[PDB]
Amino acid sequence: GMVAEVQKQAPPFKKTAVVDGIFEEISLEKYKGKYVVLAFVPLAFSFVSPTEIVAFSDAAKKFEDQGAQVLFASTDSEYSLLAWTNLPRKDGGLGPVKVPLLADKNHSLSRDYGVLIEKEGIALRGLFIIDPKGIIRHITINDLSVGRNVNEALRLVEGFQWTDKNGTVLPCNWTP
Amino acid sequence: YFQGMVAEVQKQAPPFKKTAVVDGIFEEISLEKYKGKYVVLAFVPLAFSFVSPTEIVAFSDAAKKFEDQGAQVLFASTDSEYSLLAWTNLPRKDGGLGPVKVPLLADKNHSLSRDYGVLIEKEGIALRGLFIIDPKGIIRHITINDLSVGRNVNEALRLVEGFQWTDKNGTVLPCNWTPGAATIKPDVKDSKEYFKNAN
Amino acid sequence: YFQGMVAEVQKQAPPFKKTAVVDGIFEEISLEKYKGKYVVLAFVPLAFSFVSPTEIVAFSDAAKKFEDQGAQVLFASTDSEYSLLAWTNLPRKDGGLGPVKVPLLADKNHSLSRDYGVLIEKEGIALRGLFIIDPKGIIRHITINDLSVGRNVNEALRLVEGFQWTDKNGTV
Amino acid sequence: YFQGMVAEVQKQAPPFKKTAVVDGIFEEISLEKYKGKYVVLAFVPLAFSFVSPTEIVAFSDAAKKFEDQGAQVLFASTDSEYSLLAWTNLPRKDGGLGPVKVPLLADKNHSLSRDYGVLIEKEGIALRGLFIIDPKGIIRHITINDLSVGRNVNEALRLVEGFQWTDKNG
Amino acid sequence: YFQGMVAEVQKQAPPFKKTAVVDGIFEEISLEKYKGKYVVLAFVPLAFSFVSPTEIVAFSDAAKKFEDQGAQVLFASTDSEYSLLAWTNLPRKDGGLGPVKVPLLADKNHSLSRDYGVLIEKEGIALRGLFIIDPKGIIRHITINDLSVGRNVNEALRLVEGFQWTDKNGTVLPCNWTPGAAT
Amino acid sequence: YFQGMVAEVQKQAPPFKKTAVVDGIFEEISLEKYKGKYVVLAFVPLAFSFVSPTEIVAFSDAAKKFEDQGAQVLFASTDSEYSLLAWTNLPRKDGGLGPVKVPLLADKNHSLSRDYGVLIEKEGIALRGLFIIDPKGIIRHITINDLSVGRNVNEALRLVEGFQWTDKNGTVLPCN
Amino acid sequence: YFQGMVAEVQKQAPPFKKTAVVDGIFEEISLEKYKGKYVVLAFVPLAFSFVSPTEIVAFSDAAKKFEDQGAQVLFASTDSEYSLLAWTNLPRKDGGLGPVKVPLLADKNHSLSRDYGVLIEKEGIALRGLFIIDPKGIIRHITINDLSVGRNVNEALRLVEGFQWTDKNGT
Amino acid sequence: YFQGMVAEVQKQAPPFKKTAVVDGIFEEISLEKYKGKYVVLAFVPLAFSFVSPTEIVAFSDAAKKFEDQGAQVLFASTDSEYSLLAWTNLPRKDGGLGPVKVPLLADKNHSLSRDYGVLIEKEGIALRGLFIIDPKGIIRHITINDLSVGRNVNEALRLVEGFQWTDKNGT
Amino acid sequence: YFQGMVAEVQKQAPPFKKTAVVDGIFEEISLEKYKGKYVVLAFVPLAFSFVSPTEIVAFSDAAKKFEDQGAQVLFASTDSEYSLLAWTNLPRKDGGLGPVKVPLLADKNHSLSRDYGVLIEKEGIALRGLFIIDPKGIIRHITINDLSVGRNVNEALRLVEGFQWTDKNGTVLPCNWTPGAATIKP
Amino acid sequence: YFQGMVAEVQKQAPPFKKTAVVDGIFEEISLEKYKGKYVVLAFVPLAFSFVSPTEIVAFSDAAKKFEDQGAQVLFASTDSEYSLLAWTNLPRKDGGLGPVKVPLLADKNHSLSRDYGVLIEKEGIALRGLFIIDPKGIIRHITINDLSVGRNVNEALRLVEGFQWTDKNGTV
């Protein structure tokens, strides 16, 4: 019974995903050695979620510079997620994108990470930062009406990279 | 809320009543006391230790900015009220924190930390957890950091003002929203205006 | 009906109240809404999938025949209302579904699919199940197809037409 | 399959071994005896009743058409093999079934009906269930009718052909 | 008696209510219908079986003797009422039962055979049990026969007349008395 | 047969080993002692009381007829072997059953009555049960009478003879 | 007393109601019938046995001495009332018991022997137990012998006179 | 015998190993020590109390007779071995017990009295029970008196002699 | 106190009612008899042994000092009232206890030792536990020694004086107050 | 000892391994470390509490006397090692504990206070318990005082000598 918690090992997974208009299986294991930023969104074709995906996608290189893979996830199917990329951003779609979109249709991923609203069948806006050994170092969970902050995710990755490399709490006046 | 339950977003916050340090004397503080205001509840692991001084100082400095958004900030740890008092009293040279403008709650029996799901049982201390609780007692946001990196007081403010907004206006806030930025009406037709002006 | 029960022929159909796409808007649809009418409840596995659309159009094209027989057709899948809505806005030629004349019920929390015993738990999707519910809420018929093969709209009509003749005449 | 389980699309059909009536004499029929073939298993509620004969006759008459699809039709009911035999020896004019081309299986202890989820427990009879089983023993389709309306033989043919086609191709 | 109980001598007979074939039509027969009377419930072999209904016609031929002693004979099997009906409509010369003068109860859900402890669960048929139930619903005699051998109708009458004699008078009956007395 | 099991038609009869009165002395009788023969086991409720003498005498007087059919008759009650011995030894003028030609088994501990389903728990006596067990130990027939009406020795005879015919024993006869 | 309890000293005696042979007839006997008297309840294993007869006889003979102590003697076995009567109808010289002045209780359903803790389950017979029950229903003494050795009338009298006395005088 | 079992006639006696007073000295006494002999195990409720010393002295005085019959007498109470010792060191005129020739066993943790079914739970003392145990360890007799009436040393002698005889001769 | 609860500091003391030797006579002693007073309850293992007698005499010799502090000493063991009486009737020169000025409670059914957590189950004797119980029934102090070392009568007097001072002079500072509050420095 | 077990006289003492403040630095202290020696484990007042600190100081001043008797004194509280450290660094002239000559163990996870029976669950603090443990690890003495009154260092010494003596000889 997987329950995502900070300081403990992330629940593993293997999910079908949309990777450049194509289906691919993605595991967490695939990315051992890198940091992973796993972000959940509620609903394909909804309102805040497309803006979040678009924002992290555009900063993909920044994450890649900090040695981190961004992954998104929802309880929608890989076909809905694929149609979602084929829909232009001006129409509340994603346009093509540079981060995988994992399909959690049997809800095991959201449940394992503790973000499933069981009455609705959707995830909350949960974000998890997972380190190269698979340990969860940070959790953010937002109620549905308020989007997350890309920079905050970047700050944290860089900060945990730093305290990992050096073996110390951050300097008194550290910034990214 | 029901006994045995851990803090969760969209659910009622675990109630509490704790002895706290408030301007150099002790005062009992309850969540109930603030029903009607937003509450920001932040945990720290240990008095007289590493990252927590900067965090507490940052949030205490911003206390006026939180009140201007109708929010009360509260800090908690598994230390006793006597240690927390000492922490605020002692000169800097004796590793003192200085007086702070927020209450410091003593969770020495560990019930608050356990109820909010931030206790490291084996260690007897809380992770760097932060909770935003709305005026009805519902948890709108959860942050939990491992111990080595601190939190960002500006993000906490952003988020408070964010839930105040969606509460007052019933719009919804895009990614990276700041106060005044475009918001979305959560209706399939009305939302299109936003997606056009944004692209 | 009792909670925890799965749909069975001769028993009260599991009640439900679901959000649905009706003519490009959202409407709440319960089973109870249709006491006194036959209901034909059809499940499909996946929006933006392949066999599901051709079936939904068969039945949509046939809505008037059912309406004549005093019957309401309903489709459901485990997709959200937003995905189902987008499906219908995508034209039939572009790989979409196009608009249709039968409600599309969103079973995102899986309760409907589970109550009717058509959920594939590991997949998050419903088999191709079809249920005929009579005016008193009793299930009179059950079809479940594996995923590769679509159903037959003339069978649905045949079966509705039949159960009405037998209800009305006392014979078989 | 695990005993205690009920028939379900995408899963292994429950196995069975039953005395049946074939062309006027008794014979044990099992599901195993038909691996490699599609199997159309259809239940009827009662021998010497009124809707079931017409159904059986329609499927009997179509017997060759199923054989041409790699398919074996079986009927079963909770009647004894002795009632089922007497049922076929009573000519149709006389209200009987007459002879037919399909085995009639006798589920007198009820295990088959219960395993396939068609038993009406308080009545001791089966509903009008029909199951399509592929050569590998997986149920590809389930039809269950209430008692007053019969099934469609052409639809069962249509389905078998359909699952064969997608089995081999896409 | 209690639910799930089985039939036992000195105890209350499990109640029942079953569709039956009577004079070529369907009728509902309960034990309650015969309060005040002795009831002889016999379980009989599968309809149309290769065994023979000579036992059934014996009790049928005897029905009025039981009647005259204030008893009702009932038969039961696990066949449907439709099968039993067809059985009676099939003349004996042709391999059937022909008409009979006692109710043929259809225990197609097997509850009767189970409650009376004669059900062979794996075959779905009943053994040839016979039960004598008095006017208060108490079982006074049980016979259970293997499927091969028959029961003796006159011996069942003897037993009825005996329990009647000993009920009415409070005596006991070691004496073996000729049955079939005219009344 | 398994332990805790009650006597049932078509199943193995419950084994037993009981002390019996046979021609004025004691003997151990087990069912096992009569494999190959039919066995007719009959219970009575009480030594020194009313209908059981007539039954025991009827059956005793017929013992040779039963032997002629390949069967052994046994009677049982919950009386001790001492009460039964005394019952056979007593002078009629006083109530003596007298000597009899069938064993009287002592079920003082009630295990026989219980295994065969005929014990009246509250009374500590057996109903008038009769069992016919075939040479293979299979029960073929059960009669149980309430206490006020006697059994028919001729019917037990008829029945044994009937089972000897179903057994055929090298003879093929018509359905009659 | 609670149901399923076994006879125990200082505790209330399990109640009973049993058919018995009294002076050649059948009479229901309960313990209640002697509330106010001491009761000496003795079990024997078997009618038409060998040790038990002589025990009952010694106790029937001395039944005078007992009633002079406000005490009722009662015997019991798992035999039926018909066996017990037959046994008493059969004279001693002929290997029986002969008539006796103390009731003989029939515990054919075994509940009495089981309740008083003397039933040999595998045998369906009672050990040679003897229980002294005071006027309030309290067991004040228990003897249980194995089958091969009998009891002693005088020891039962000694115990009755004794509890009589200490009850009267608290010493 | 199985753990949790209580002493019952025809069954194996619960075993024990207990500190005892044996002629002013402390000695461990087990039942196994007496395999081959009869054991008469007698319980008394309370050192420095009343009925018990006369009983113990009667049995100690008969020490001889019992050994003639090949039997060992043991007494036992829930008192400690220090109270028991002091009991025998207190002379009898001075309300003590004086010296005695039977072991005095100390059941201060109560397990012996519990196992032989004589412990009065609420009081922490044993009833006046006596057990005759044969050379094979089987209990052949049980006596239990309420506290106010004592036991008869002759009856125990009789019973031992009785079971000796039937062991060797049948009948 | 709930039933089956064991004695703990700050919690209600397990109640009891026991037969006791008081001045060569039997008397029923309950805790209730002494509400309003401190109670010092001390356990000893065994009548007619070596260490226990000198503990009892020490406390007996000081019973007036205890009375002056408003306290009652009670002693207890798993011996019976008859053994205990005999113990006191046996002079010390002869290896007994002598008469004493404190009750000796007979805990023969072991309920007292079990409830106060000092019973050695396998041995049927109490450890050397001492408990101080205040006038409202709250256990304020527990001491348990192994059998080989006796206790200190003056330490019990000390503790009672200490609890009676706390009871009359409450707390160190007023409610919520701190030494630093209401003061100004540079 | 078995896990879950509370400290009892005559039984093996619950083992422990705890971070401790010793001469102003952190060190792991375990019971196992003082096998051979007697151990006097005393639970103390919360760091920075308003109570007289003289109890702690008496035992620290007596440390050498305990060492002279083959005994090691330990203190424990539910405070963290950082609070304990700030407390010993704060001189008494400023209201602290000042440096002490015995280990201060931090039981911030409460296992020690719980294993030893002194934890007040509802308050997260230990009562003033004192345990004397012999070189085989057996608990020989227990004292538990309500929070308002102190322990007597002399009594602790007496008891240690008493047990040293009765172990070396046999008598009281």
Q: Chain E interface, mutation test: which of F12, F146, F161, F176, most E Cβ atoms within 10 Å?
A: F146
Q: Write out the residue range of the structural domain in which residue J95 sits.
A: 1-172
* Contact present, G and H (at least 3 Cβ pairs less than 8 Å): yes
Residue type, A39: A
D163:C140 CB<8 A: no
Cβ J28 vs Cβ J17: under 8 Å: yes
Burial of E99 (0-12, 13-18, 19+ CB in 10 A): middle
Q: Which of G133, G111, G100, G144 is nearest to G33 (CA)?
A: G133
DSSP J22: E
The reply to whether residue F124 touches residue G47, judged by beta carbons under 8 angstroms, is no
B8 vs I: CB within 8 A? no
Which chains are adjacent to chain A, needing at least 3 Cβ pairs under 8 Å?
Answer: B, C
CA closest to I180 among chain B residues: B24
Q: How close F143 gets to chain E, by Cα (Å)?
A: 5
Asked whether the beta carbons of residue I162 and residue J150 sit closer than 8 angstroms, the reply is yes
Sequence-separated (6 or more) residues with CB below 8 Å from residue J41: J74, J76, J116, J130, J131, J132, J133
Quote the CA–CA distance of H15 and J124 in Å, as a whole number.
Answer: 49
Distance from the Cα of D121 to chain E's closest Cα (Å) equals 7
Q: How far is CA D96 from CA C54, D100, D150, F31, G46, in A?
A: 43, 11, 18, 52, 70
Closest partner residue to B109 (CB to CB) among J82, J108, J124 is J124
Cβ separation of F83 and G79 shorter than 8 Å? Answer: yes
With contacts defined as CB-CB under 8 Å, which chain I residues touch B85? Answer: 178
User: Is the separation of the CB atoms in E106 and E84 below 8 Å?
Assistant: yes
- Using CA atoms, how far apart are residues H46 and H39, in angstroms rounded to an integer? 22
Chains C and F touch (3+ CB pairs under 8 A): no
User: Which chains sit next to E, with 3 or more Cβ pairs under 8 A?
Assistant: D, F
C57 and chain D in contact, CB less than 8 A: no
Task: State whether F83 and G48 contact (CB < 8 Å).
Answer: yes
Q: What is the DSSP string of C84-151?
A: HHHHHHS-GGGTS----SS-EEE-TTSHHHHHTT-EETTTTEE-EEEEEE-TTSBEEEEEEE-TTS--
The CATH number of the domain holding residue G113 is 3.40.30.10
Q: Which two tokens stand for residue G133?
A: 């029950």
Beta carbons of D159 and C146 less than 8 Å apart: no
Chain G, 35 to 54: residues with Cβ < 8 Å from chain H are none
Distance CA C104, CA H103 (A): 94
- Smallest Cβ–Cβ distance between I149 and the set J145, J152, J159 belongs to J159
- G141 vs H: CB within 8 A: yes
Asked if J50 lies within 8 A of B121 by C-beta distance, the reply is no
CA dist E75 and E21 (Å) reads 10
SS3 of F127-167:
CEEEEEECCCCEEEEEEEECCCECCCHHHHHHHHHHHHHHC
Distance CA(G58)–CA(G44), nearest Å, equals 13
Structural domain count of chain G = 1
Q: In Å, how far are F56, I73, J50, J58 from J54, measured between CA atoms?
A: 101, 30, 12, 6
Instruction: Please check whether residue E157 touches D, CB under 8 A.
Output: no
Burial D68-101 (b: 16+ CB within 10 A, else e): ebbbbbbbbbbbbbbbbbbbbbbeeeeebbbebb
Inter-chain touch I178–B26, beta carbons under 8 Å: yes
User: Are I48 and H85 in contact (CB < 8 Å)?
Assistant: yes
CB C75 within 8 A of CB C42: yes
Determine the length of chain I: 186
Say if CB B128 and CB B147 are below 8 A apart: yes
> Is the Cβ–Cβ distance between D113 and D78 less than 8 Å?
yes
Q: Is B4 on the interface with I (CB under 8 A)?
A: no
> C17 touching A, CB under 8 A?
no
Q: Looking at the complex, does the CB of residue H120 fall below 8 Å from at least one CB of chain G?
A: yes
Cα separation, A42 vs A126, in Å, equals: 9
Closest CA to G123 of G78, G74, G85, G75: G78
Q: Which two tokens stand for residue J108?
A: 């911030």
Widest distance between CA atoms in chain A: 48
Q: Tell me if A142 and B9 make a contact (CB, 8 A cut-off).
A: yes
Distant-in-sequence contacts of B92-99, Cβ < 8 A, 24+ apart: B94/J86, B94/J89, B94/J90, B94/J94, B95/B48, B95/J86, B95/J89, B97/B47, B97/B53, B97/B56, B97/B57, B98/B57, B99/B23, B99/B24
Tell me which chains share at least 3 CB pairs under 8 Å with chain F. E, G
Cβ-defined contact of C48 to A80 (cutoff 8 Å): yes
Q: Three-state DSSP class for C76?
A: strand
Record: contact J172-I163, CB cut-off 8 A: no
CA dihedral over E159, E164, E170, E176, signed as positive or negative: negative
G146 shares contact with chain H (CB less than 8 Å): yes
CB contact under 8 A, D122 and E109: yes
Instruction: Tell me how far CA of residue H68 lies from CA of F171, G150, H62, H160, in angstroms.
Output: 77, 22, 10, 11
- Per DSSP, the three-state class of I112 is helix
Backbone angles phi, psi at F61, to 5 degrees: -55, -25
Nearest-Cα residue of chain E relative to residue F160: E149
Task: Give the integer Cα–Cα distance in Å for B24 and B46.
Answer: 19
The radius of gyration computed from the CA coordinates of chain G, to the nearest angstrom, equals: 15
Q: Is B108 on the interface with J (CB under 8 A)?
A: yes
Among G46, G77, G109, pick the best mutation site for testing chain F contact (most F Cβ within 10 A).
G109
- Flag if B27 and I176 touch (Cβ within 8 Å): yes
Interface residue D158 vs chain C (CB under 8 A) = yes
Other Cβ atoms less than 10 A from the Cβ of E165: the count is: 16
Whether B155 and A152 lie within 8 Å, measured CB to CB: yes
DSSP H55-67: HHHHHHHTHHHHH
E12: DSSP letter: B
Sign of the C-alpha dihedral, residues H26, H31, H32, H36?
Answer: positive
Q: How far is G53 from chain H (nearest CA, A)?
A: 14
Helix, strand, coil percentages in chain D from 3-state DSSP, rounded to 5: 30, 30, 40
Question: How many whole angstroms from its chain centre is CA C89?
Answer: 20
Q: Per the CB < 8 Å rule, is F86 touching G90?
A: yes
End-to-end CA distance of chain G: 27
Chains touching C (3+ CB pairs < 8 Å): A, D
Give this entry's resolution in angstroms: 2.2
State the nearest Cα–Cα gap between J29 and chain B, in angstroms: 16
* Residue listed under structure tokens 């021609």: F23
Residues of E in contact with D109 (CB under 8 A): 121-124
User: Residue G90 — φ and ψ, nearest 5°?
Assistant: -75, 110
Cα separation, A16 vs H119, in Å, equals 73
Minimal CA separation from H24 to chain G, in Å: 31
Contact I/B (≥3 CB pairs under 8 Å): yes
The burial of E50, by beta-carbon neighbours within 10 Å (0-12 exposed, 13-18 middle, 19 or more buried), is given as: exposed
- CA-based nearest distance J162→chain I, Å: 6
Distance CA G151, CA G73 (A): 14
For residue G155, what are the contacts with CB-CB under 8 A and spacing of at least 6?
Answer: G143, H152, H155
Asked if I104 has any chain H CB less than 8 Å from its own CB, the reply is: no
Reference H85, options H3, H160, H26, H151; nearest CA is H26
Q: I94 CB near a chain H CB, below 8 Å? A: no
Q: From chain E, pick out residues whose CB is under 8 angstroms from the CB of D119.
A: none
Alpha-carbon gap: E71 to the closest alpha carbon of chain D (Å): 29
